[PDB]
């Protein structure tokens with residue numbers, strides 16, 4: 001008879017324990033996840049026009065889409081009990097399953113309408129033959145508060161993938177409006193060429209009567225991944241039955257990749273998944289002025305291939321312009337990347353689903369936000385996309401979570417020295433202005449939704465640490481560490497120009513006791529923020545299901561002129577440890593998330609870390625403990 005004692009050594013085999021015995025050990029408190037069970041792709045978010053409430057959706061137990069609503073973006077309420085589902089398979093269009101979908105706020109009967117992938121056959125994978133009719137796109141209407149979506153009584157409105165095209169996947173429709181797509185499709189061919197005449201048209205565009213675009217994700221066997229573009233037939237905002245196919249507005253060659261060696265934004269892989277089309281400004285989201293950005297998951301594989309297995313699940317993003325399809329009879333429009341990166345460098349991070357959050361939303365009024373934002377929710381699969389080695393799933397009682405809501409916008413890096421570090425090929429940024437002297441850079445901005453960040457530090461205890469410098473190898477525990485695994489660690493690290501060339505590794509050690517620790521440090525050798533999990537869990541050695549491989553992402557610290565003086569860019573860190581869920585943010589442009597399933601309650605020590613190689617200066621190091629409860633009503 002074994003009752004869980006986390007002050008004692010864990011059992012050698014966690015999978016033998018009784019169901020739900022591990023329900024709270026690693027569970028987060030300020031993250032979006034169902035009351036119990038498993039959570040899949042987040043999807044179907046939308047601001048309810050009538051109430052201003054923001055709805056969040058996500059696949060649940062592989063049995064359809066479930067939901068919840070929020071008024072502040074800080075706290076949530078399940079739409080209903082028993083799973084809080086909104087729609088599930090069993091219909092004539094989705095007899096086998098219900099995949100990712102999106103919502104048009106004012107659609108059929110002027111109510112929230114869901115366009116989603118209705119599934120009729122399984123399995124479905126880029127590495128195996130595609131069964132005709134596997135995935136179709138259907139409509140459902142929100143009924144009784146967005147607390148339930150009723151499938152319209154008719155077949156799918158997009159009943160088949162492009163004609164005779166041997167697609168690898170046809171799913172995850174995402175709806176959006178675009179001033180530039182309307183102009184490009186409305187103008188002439190020799191007139192919609194000059195950016196002069198086009199811009200002039202874009203200036204008149206009006207969002208409220210604009211038609212809707214639909215980007216469907218997948219690829220084509222033998223040719224490459226791609227996104228399939230559609231739009232209300234004839235550009236008629238009142239048409240929801242027929243969608244004119246606009247072509248493969250974006251495609252890449254099989255397992256090709258950004259940059260010559262795929263260093264900043266993985267590989268395009270074998271198939272595109274869960275595409276999101278955004279229009280960003282330096283302040284937020286604007287479908288008329290915003291630059292086109294696209295977030296998407298790409299599925300990779302090493303050789304030889306393992307049927308129905310995707311070894312790599314990259315959570316990428318790209319930005320670029322959209323233009324006419326040249327002079328040949330193909331895609332009406334074409335997305336051309338100028339830069340690309342990672343929305344989250346976590347192995348387990350994937351399938352993002354975001355949405356525009358209007359300044360007119362209840363969330364924004366209450367909070368006082370004056371602009372439109374685009375909030376993104378990244379998935380953090382709990383069992384390595386179901387390839388885990390016997391994770392004690394029955395013992396935990398749940399699987400996966402969503403990462404903290406994030407605001408996406410155009411972020412600029414000013415006063416940057418225009419050197420080889422800024423002119424490299426295939427990077428995740430473009431030079432704004434450059435006198436050949438300083439260059440302002442433009443890149444994707446990634447930050448925690450402000451209301452959520454406020455709620456995290458809202459009643460937490462604050463403990464600062466004196467600025468410190470380290471030269472010789474050392475591990476210096478904080479003057480005082482939290483006594484729980486719920487906290488926000490923030491710090492600024494400064495390095496000497498001389499460090500770029502050294503084997504320097506500097507950061508912190510968290511969730512640490514004598515038998516456990518988790519390392520988070522910056523590395524110049526490959527300029528990478530690294531999360532060393534080799535010692536995170538005393539239980540991992542004997543429980544292979546608890547993955548302990550290293551996680552890391554690329555982050556380049558540029559040479560800049562701060563006070564009429566040059567210097568290596570300051571590494572601005574923000575680490576949120578919401579229990580088994582850890583998220584590493586850096587310079588309002590980086591994000592790396594992973595699981596840190598430490599076992600003992602004692603493992604809460606925090607230490608400064610430096611490997612002697614080089615020199616580092618820590619500044620403004622502080623810790624806020626407590627976070628908050630994202631689900632009061634539970």
Ligand SMILES: OC[C@H]1O[C@@](CO)(O[C@H]2O[C@H](CO)[C@@H](O)[C@H](O)[C@H]2O)[C@@H](O)[C@@H]1O
Pocket residue numbers: 040041059099100123124125126171172273274299310350351
């Ligand atoms: O649960 C379906 C949902 O999962 C995603 C994102 O992870 O794709 C996954 O499931 C597909 C098939 O059943 C696999 O082919 C794919 O490799 C896997 O990542 C979404 O694309 C899909 O809607």
